[PDB]
Nucleic acid binder design. Structure first.
Ligand SMILES: [Mg+2]
Ligand SMILES: [Mg+2]
Ligand SMILES: [Mg+2]
Ligand SMILES: [Mg+2]
Ligand SMILES: [Mg+2]
Ligand SMILES: [Mg+2]
Ligand SMILES: [Mg+2]
Ligand SMILES: [Mg+2]
Ligand SMILES: [Mg+2]
Ligand SMILES: [Mg+2]
Ligand SMILES: [Mg+2]
Ligand SMILES: [Mg+2]
Ligand SMILES: [Mg+2]
Ligand SMILES: [Mg+2]
Ligand SMILES: [Mg+2]
Ligand SMILES: [Mg+2]
Ligand SMILES: [Mg+2]
Ligand SMILES: [Mg+2]
Ligand SMILES: [Mg+2]
Ligand SMILES: [Mg+2]
Ligand SMILES: [Mg+2]
Ligand SMILES: [Mg+2]
Ligand SMILES: [Mg+2]
Ligand SMILES: [Mg+2]
Ligand SMILES: [Mg+2]
Ligand SMILES: [Mg+2]
Ligand SMILES: [Mg+2]
Ligand SMILES: [Mg+2]
Ligand SMILES: [Mg+2]
Ligand SMILES: [Mg+2]
Ligand SMILES: [Mg+2]
Ligand SMILES: [Mg+2]
Ligand SMILES: [Mg+2]
Ligand SMILES: [Mg+2]
Ligand SMILES: [Mg+2]
Ligand SMILES: [Mg+2]
Ligand SMILES: [Mg+2]
Ligand SMILES: [Mg+2]
Ligand SMILES: [Mg+2]
Ligand SMILES: [Mg+2]
Ligand SMILES: [Mg+2]
Ligand SMILES: [Mg+2]
Ligand SMILES: [Mg+2]
Ligand SMILES: [Mg+2]
Ligand SMILES: [Mg+2]
Lengths: 149, 100, 271, 77
RNA sequence: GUUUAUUAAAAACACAGCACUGUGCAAACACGAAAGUGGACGUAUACGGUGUGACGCCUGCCCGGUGCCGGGAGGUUAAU
């Protein structure tokens, strides 16, 4: 496969390169998410003039907008005051939904799929560093704090 | 009713919780009639051998008078709790003071 | 108790009854009852798939709660009842709010005992918990294999799973077979041992005891003719061929396990 | 039925020739799979039961170009 | 108790009990090109297969052969 690339691919690609890839990677990952497109005569012509000059930079400034999205919440900390057991050992495990809702209610307006958790589902009561995937390169560092009521 | 001598040991990282844990185990017994005769936190003391693959356990000596209902309820709370590395409960022969 | 029957008539001679004096003498709670029509071992196509089943006493299905969805609501055990559809006995649990449900009765349980279920609760026989909350090296039953499902493992009278170990998300269980199976920690498990442990010591006594339990006579291959079964014919009790099913596959030492997708979950096979 | 949505590859019959040429009737099934294809036109996934060679036709042409041909015959997807 | 309706009712079949064996649940297994059904709205004190055939006393030696189970280096070994 040829495959012309719209987005910055992690390892092999780098915006508008016609590098060879396995068809599965094209049809299961690169195409459906809108990262690359198949390169067959007429597509190459759409990428040559229209996309590469204008829409590549519009796709680039959206990464700067994604970098700005991290700067919405200048505090970078969330104090979860959920219900707890008898000295540690929390009532329920804090999933991605509670963190996403707690951050969205008063902080960054980010979706749940971007919110990652390095140290599991967070059952221990205390301070926990959490990192979101706002952009492929730039990661956030929010200081989540689980407090026992 | 009956005098006892509880000596339990606690995991190093959860030694911060021990001030709290004492306040709960005191609250259980002191509410039910019998008083606590001695409070003596030995602290992070070195172990003679490794229990549960670690060194330096946090010892806590209570020594308390209580009925049989409460002391056995306290004995069950040690086993259903990962913080407490072992414990033992002695018999009467009156109350005491001092010694370490 | 396990009471032997006196030998007034041959057939009575050998009978041993598991006479539980607690099991409610009266009709069950109707709202959880429903019909359970017998198949007789036949399927969609009307053909005997599984042999040796047909007849027996008519029996209704009691809707037993394996899932245990009621979180943080105490529930008094109203009365113990006889489930005809199951080996274990059942307990008519009455929840504090109003609902009534049937559950499998654990060993240490009577009418008046209280049960709580959910996330926190207490560590006590009958109380349902996620396996992450349950202590390591503890007797459980009514165990789920997948989180949020009903309850698969250890439901038969006197059966119980033991939790051996755990590493974060997974819990290693030692099942009654001897098999050490790895399950998910979010799965629930009703604490303690399943009651009616004396079940095993009953001995039926007569042919008709099997027939009113919904079992039919098993004819031995050797008795049959060569057309019917691989063991067959021979003028006066011959054999001389290796033990096999009616359909040629070798019984008597032959590994028929071939799932392959679940093999990752099995830590160690039974012995 | 074991029919590819795209190409129309059905299961044909034939013989199962042994070393002594004993012709026993068999049948050749096609390599079918229920795959989900992202259609860029309407921004959605479309489940199609296709042969492995069908997928190569969907990769050769456009999924839209194949869905144009599928709708011409009068089929669903 | 069942059995050769229409020449055999028995010592034959079954039987309760006994054992070996398979089966961790989308169970083994069975019917079925498949979907899907039974098994079972059952979950190893359960289920299928094989043998033996209440109860009492017992059930000895052989793993060379045929099967099965485990080992997994070496030899030989198909498509590719
Ligand atoms: Mg390939
Ligand atoms: Mg009645
Ligand atoms: Mg049915
Ligand atoms: Mg029907
Ligand atoms: Mg059977
Ligand atoms: Mg036995
Ligand atoms: Mg038996
Ligand atoms: Mg039998
Ligand atoms: Mg015969
Ligand atoms: Mg034949
Ligand atoms: Mg037949
Ligand atoms: Mg034959
Ligand atoms: Mg004969
Ligand atoms: Mg002979
Ligand atoms: Mg012979
Ligand atoms: Mg053979
Ligand atoms: Mg054979
Ligand atoms: Mg063995
Ligand atoms: Mg064809
Ligand atoms: Mg055709
Ligand atoms: Mg051939
Ligand atoms: Mg011919
Ligand atoms: Mg589908
Ligand atoms: Mg008849
Ligand atoms: Mg007759
Ligand atoms: Mg006759
Ligand atoms: Mg005739
Ligand atoms: Mg006659
Ligand atoms: Mg016996
Ligand atoms: Mg047996
Ligand atoms: Mg088949
Ligand atoms: Mg059913
Ligand atoms: Mg016999
Ligand atoms: Mg005999
Ligand atoms: Mg005999
Ligand atoms: Mg004997
Ligand atoms: Mg012998
Ligand atoms: Mg000898
Ligand atoms: Mg040998
Ligand atoms: Mg072998
Ligand atoms: Mg090795
Ligand atoms: Mg090798
Ligand atoms: Mg080799
Ligand atoms: Mg070789
Ligand atoms: Mg070679």
């Amino acid at each position: 496969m040829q495959v012309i690339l719209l987005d910055k691919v992690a390892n092999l690609g780098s915006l508008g390169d016609q590098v060879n890839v396995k068809a599965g990677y094209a049809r299961n990952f690169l195409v459906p998410q809108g990262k690359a497109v198949p390169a067959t005569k007429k597509n190459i012509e759409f990428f040559e003039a229209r996309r590469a000059e204008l829409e590549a930079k519009l796709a680039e400034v959206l990464a700067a907008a994604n970098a700005r999205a991290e700067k919405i919440n200048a505090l970078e900390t969330v104090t979860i005051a959920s219900k707890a057991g008898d000295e540690g050992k929390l009532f329920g495990s804090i999933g991605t939904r509670d963190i996403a809702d707690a951050v969205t209610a008063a902080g960054v307006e980010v979706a749940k799929s971007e919110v990652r958790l390095p140290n599991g589902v967070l059952r221990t009561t205390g301070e926990h560093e959490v990192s979101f995937q706002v952009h492929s390169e730039v990661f956030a560092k929010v200081i989540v704090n689980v407090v026992a009521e | 009713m009956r005098h006892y001598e509880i000596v339990f040991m606690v995991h190093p990282d959860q030694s911060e919780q021990v001030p709290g844990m004492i306040e709960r185990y005191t609250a259980a017994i002191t509410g039910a009639e019998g008083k606590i005769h001695r409070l003596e936190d030995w602290g992070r003391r070195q172990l003679a051998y490794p229990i549960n693959k670690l060194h330096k356990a946090h010892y806590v000596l209570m020594n308390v008078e209580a009925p049989q209902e409460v002391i056995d309820e306290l004995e069950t709370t040690f086993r259903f709790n990962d913080a407490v590395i072992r414990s033992m409960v002695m018999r009467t022969k009156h109350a005491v003071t001092e010694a370490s | 108790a396990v009471v032997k029957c006196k030998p007034t008539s041959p057939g009575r001679r050998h009978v041993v009854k598991v006479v539980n004096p607690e099991l409610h003498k009266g009709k069950p709670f109707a709202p959880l009852l429903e019909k359970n029509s017998k198949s007789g071992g036949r399927n969609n196509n009307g053909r005997i798939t599984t042999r040796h089943i047909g007849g027996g006493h008519k029996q209704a299905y009691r809707i037993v709660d394996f899932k245990r969805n009621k979180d943080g609501i105490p529930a008094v055990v109203e009365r113990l009842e006889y489930d005809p559809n199951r080996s274990a006995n059942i307990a008519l649990v009455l929840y504090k709010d109003g609902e009534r449900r049937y559950i499998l009765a654990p060993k240490g349980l009577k009418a008046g005992d209280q049960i709580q279920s959910g996330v926190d609760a207490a560590i006590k026989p009958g109380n349902t918990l996620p396996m992450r909350n349950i202590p390591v090296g503890s007797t459980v039953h009514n165990v789920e294999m997948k989180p949020g499902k009903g309850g698969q493992l250890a439901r038969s009278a006197g059966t119980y799973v033991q939790i051996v170990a755990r590493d974060g998300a997974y819990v290693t269980l030692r099942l009654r077979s001897g098999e050490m199976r790895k399950v998910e920690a979010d799965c629930r498990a009703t604490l303690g041992e399943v009651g009616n442990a004396e079940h095993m010591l009953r001995v039926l006594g007569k042919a008709g005891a099997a027939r009113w339990r919904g079992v039919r006579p098993t004819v031995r291959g050797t008795a049959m003719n060569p057309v019917d079964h691989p063991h067959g014919g021979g003028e006066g009790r011959n054999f001389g061929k290796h033990p096999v099913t009616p359909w040629g596959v070798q019984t008597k030492g032959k590994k028929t396990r071939s799932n392959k997708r679940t093999d990752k979950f099995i830590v160690r096979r039974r012995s | 039925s074991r029919v590819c949505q795209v190409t129309g590859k059905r299961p044909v019959t034939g013989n199962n020739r042994s070393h002594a040429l004993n012709a026993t009737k068999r049948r050749f099934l096609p390599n079918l799979h229920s795959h989900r294809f992202w259609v860029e036109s309407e921004k959605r996934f479309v489940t199609l039961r296709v042969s492995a060679k069908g997928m190569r036709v969907i990769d050769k042409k456009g999924i839209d170009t194949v869905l144009a041909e599928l709708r011409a015959r009068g089929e669903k997807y």
